[PDB]
Amino acid sequence: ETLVRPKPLLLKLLKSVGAQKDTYTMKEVLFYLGQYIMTKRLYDEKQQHIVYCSNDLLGDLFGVPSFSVKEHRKIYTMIYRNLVV
Amino acid sequence: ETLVRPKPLLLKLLKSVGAQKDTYTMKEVLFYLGQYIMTKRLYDEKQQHIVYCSNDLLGDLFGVPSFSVKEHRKIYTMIYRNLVV
C-alpha cells in the first residue's frame, strides 16, 4: 500500500509513542494515532468515542477542543490535512 | 457471540479503563485489555510486542514479569484462566 508522509506535529505525535519512520501506511498511521489517544488517556471515560484535544498536541494538529470518533469522514479529513499523501 | 465472565483481577483491570459490565464477548475483553496495556504504557518502546507486567495488576493476573504479544496461544491461555467461559 502507499506510504504517506506525516506533517511535523503528527510526526511528533507518532514518534512520541515509538513510531520510528518518516513515512507510513495509512493503516499504521491509524494504529499509532489510536495508541497515542489511549496512552495519554484522552478518551472520555463514560462515552468512549469522545476524545479531548484541549491543551494537547492532538488539538494543535486537529484544530478542535474535542471530537467524536463516530464522525468517520471528519476524522479522515483532519488526518489527511496532516499528511502529504 | 457468547458472553464470558471475568474473574475479579481481570474485571478490576477492565473497569479501570471504563468497561461497565460483569460479562463481555471475548472480542470486547481483547479491546479493553489492549486499551489498558496502552493506557498504562506497559509496552516496550522499541520492541512493541513486549509487555512489562512486573508490579502491575496485569502481572498479578497473568503470573509473569513480561510477555510477548506474538505468543498467541500463551496469551489466550493466560486470558482464559482469568475468565469463566
Binding site: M38, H49, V69, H72 | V17, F31
Partner: peptide, 11 residues
C-alpha cells in the same frame, strides 16, 4: 463500547 473498538471501526 471501548474507545479501542470505536477506533478500529474507522477501518
Amino acid at each position: 463500547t471501548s474507545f479501542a473498538e470505536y477506533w478500529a471501526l474507522l477501518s
